[PDB]
């Protein structure tokens, strides 16, 4: 019961094998991210992976 969760909440960015945003940013009313590029394979944890 306790926890308070989520949303309808599915928002993808462009998709594709995806990518990782080093930094997602927040500033008034308009917040967003940059992505360097695409980490490889389908699924990779960038900070640990490559």
UniProtKB/Swiss-Prot annotation:
- Localization (cell): Virion
Q: Which domain of life is it from?
A: Viruses
Q: How does it assemble?
A: Heterotrimer with gp6; assembles as a (gp6)2-gp7 heterotrimeric molecule. The (gp6)2-gp7 heterotrimeric molecule further interacts with gp25 and gp53. The gp25-(gp6)2-gp7 module is involved in sheath contraction. Interacts with gp8. Binds to gp10 homotrimer; disulfide-linked. Heteromultimer with gp10; a gp10 molecule is disulfide-linked to gp7 and the other two remaining gp10 molecules form a disulfide bond.
Query: What family is this protein classified in?
Result: Belongs to the T4likevirus baseplate wedge protein gp7 family.
Q: What does this protein do?
A: Intermediate/inner baseplate protein. The gp25-(gp6)2-gp7 module is involved in sheath contraction. Involved in the tail assembly.
| Protein name per Swiss-Prot or TrEMBL | Baseplate wedge protein gp7
Gene name, Swiss-Prot/TrEMBL:
7
User: What stretch of the whole protein does this chain cover?
Assistant: 345 to 394 of 1032
